[PDB]
Amino acid sequence: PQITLWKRPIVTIKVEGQLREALLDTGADDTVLEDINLSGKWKPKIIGGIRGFVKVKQYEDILIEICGHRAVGAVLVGPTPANIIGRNMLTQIGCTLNF
Amino acid sequence: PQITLWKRPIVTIKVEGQLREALLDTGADDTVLEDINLSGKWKPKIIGGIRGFVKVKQYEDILIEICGHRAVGAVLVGPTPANIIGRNMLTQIGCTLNF
Ligand SMILES: CC(C)[C@H](NC(=O)[C@H](C)NC(=O)OCc1ccccc1)C(=O)N[C@@H](Cc1ccccc1)[C@@H](O)[C@H](O)[C@H](Cc1ccccc1)NC(=O)[C@@H](NC(=O)[C@H](C)NC(=O)OCc1ccccc1)C(C)C
Known part of the structure; x- marks a missing residue:
């Protein structure tokens, strides 16, 4: 879709049977999920x-x-404070800034 | 233009005879300029x-x-750490997220 920036660009995400709302964030290198346990190992x-x-x-x-x-x-x-979908994720859904 | 998010979406800005580089930041309500004196009064x-x-x-x-x-x-x-162009500025240059 085309998301204007008059409000926060929050979108629905689905991470492991969990629906969340995440903010599509061009100013974030990484994607940061707020306090929601993910099965698997981490570093x-x-x-x-x-x-x-x-x-x-x-x-x-x-x-x-x-x-x-x-x-x-x-x-x-x-x-x-929020789920943040960083550029690492944003490039894969083919998301671009547009003006 | 159309800015992909493979690298940081940094752009040239001109604020009062000063060229800066700012990051176009959809995860920022506001615009935040890093340590560059602006003529005028503030709150x-x-x-x-x-x-x-x-x-x-x-x-x-x-x-x-x-x-x-x-x-x-x-x-x-x-x-x-960076000049951040928040949605407040990003809506005016007609900037949208696009996927
Ligand atoms: C720019 C701010 C004014 C902005 N804040 C706001 O918009 C706030 C919510 N609005 C607001 O302040 O309005 C009034 C108000 C007051 C109180 C309560 C509510 C509202 C913000 O922090 N926005 C961030 C999202 C966010 C929002 C709310 C709560 C928490 C996070 C990112 O978009 C923003 O881009 C930041 C700022 C930034 C810019 C440039 C450099 C450093 C930091 N980067 C980030 O937070 C992301 N970090 C990055 O992208 C950095 C650059 N990478 C990084 O840290 O690399 C890892 C590393 C580790 C070790 C060494 C080197 C790198 C993060 C999600 C991963």
């Missing part, structure tokens, strides 16, 4: 933001179903 | 991110020339 990682750095679990090969389009990727899981 | 404001909340100077009616398209807006100025 420790730290993303930085505005202000600080949070500790996250990185999971590889996670399947995320984003607004009707699937995409497998590294997914970071950690105490972030 | 105190605080944006939150990943981890924490930075103090910024909000300036109204700031003219930002974004990748060939102008846009006047509230611009927040404060110790952020």
Whole structure:
């Protein structure tokens, strides 16, 4: 679809039988999922933001179903305020900025 | 133009005779400019991110020339790692997410 930016570009995602709402975020390298247990093993990682750095679990090969389009990727899981779909996921659903 | 998200969607902006590079950031409500003095008066404001909340100077009616398209807006100025063009500015250059 074509999402205008008058409101936050939140979309439905489906990660392992769990529906969430994630924000499509062009200013995020990575995808960060807020406090939702993912089956599988992970490796420790730290993303930085505005202000600080949070500790996250990185999971590889996670399947995320984003607004009707699937995409497998590294997914970071950690105490972030929102689900963030970063460019790593956004390139796979073929998402572009447009003006 | 059409910016794919394989790399950070950084673009040229012109803010008061100053060229900067800003990231077009769909996950930012506001626009945040990194440590570059803006003529004019401001009001105190605080944006939150990943981890924490930075103090910024909000300036109204700031003219930002974004990748060939102008846009006047509230611009927040404060110790952020990057210039971030938030949705507030991104709606005016007619920028949409596209997949
Ligand atoms: C999701 C992250 C992986 C993302 N980080 C990255 O992409 C960075 C560059 N990559 C990275 O960290 O790489 C890993 C690494 C590790 C070690 C060494 C080197 C590298 C990120 O948080 N980046 C953010 C800022 C940034 C930019 C450049 C460099 C570093 C950080 C925004 O782009 C991102 O879009 C966030 C999304 C977000 C929203 C809400 C909560 C948490 C995260 N927006 C923001 O932080 C913006 N805030 C907002 O939009 C808030 C929500 N609105 C607001 O403040 O309005 C008033 C308000 C006040 C109080 C409550 C509610 C509203 C900010 C730019 C102004």
